[PDB]
Amino acid sequence: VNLRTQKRLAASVLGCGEGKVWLDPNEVSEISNANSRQSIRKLVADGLIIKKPVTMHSRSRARELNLARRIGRHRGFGKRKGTADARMPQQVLWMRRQRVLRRLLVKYRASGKIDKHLYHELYHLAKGNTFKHKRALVEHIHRAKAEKARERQIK
């Protein structure tokens, strides 16, 4: 008894690969009598032909390793293989920092904490790499405000 045609037809009917087709070994003559797709569908409905489930590929180890790397494990010099720039680019870091500083300056000018001339010179200082982060820019704005208030109180 040859069942190659039946295996191919059952794969096409079940919508799977031929390695996922299960033909009942105790029903080989009745499966061999099935030459048409209607007969294969009838055997599938009878349960003589079933589609085997997929083989396991779990992501549990990947998720635990992701949580460990999030909390800081496996980040040492023995784990690093690419260069520092290949791992995190300085251009990406700079672009993020510039966008953060420009967003903060636009917010402060819109709210009215700083005026337009102060905004302009702070924009050019941020482009000239004076402030390394948002807290640095905020503290610079505060010290400039303190100097301006002291000058106004003196005058």
Partner: peptide, 13 residues
């Protein structure tokens, strides 16, 4: 034999 293939469900036998 879960490394190579999945177990047939019990409702299919």
């Amino acid at each position: 034999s879960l490394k190579n293939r999945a177990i047939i469900p019990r409702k299919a036998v």
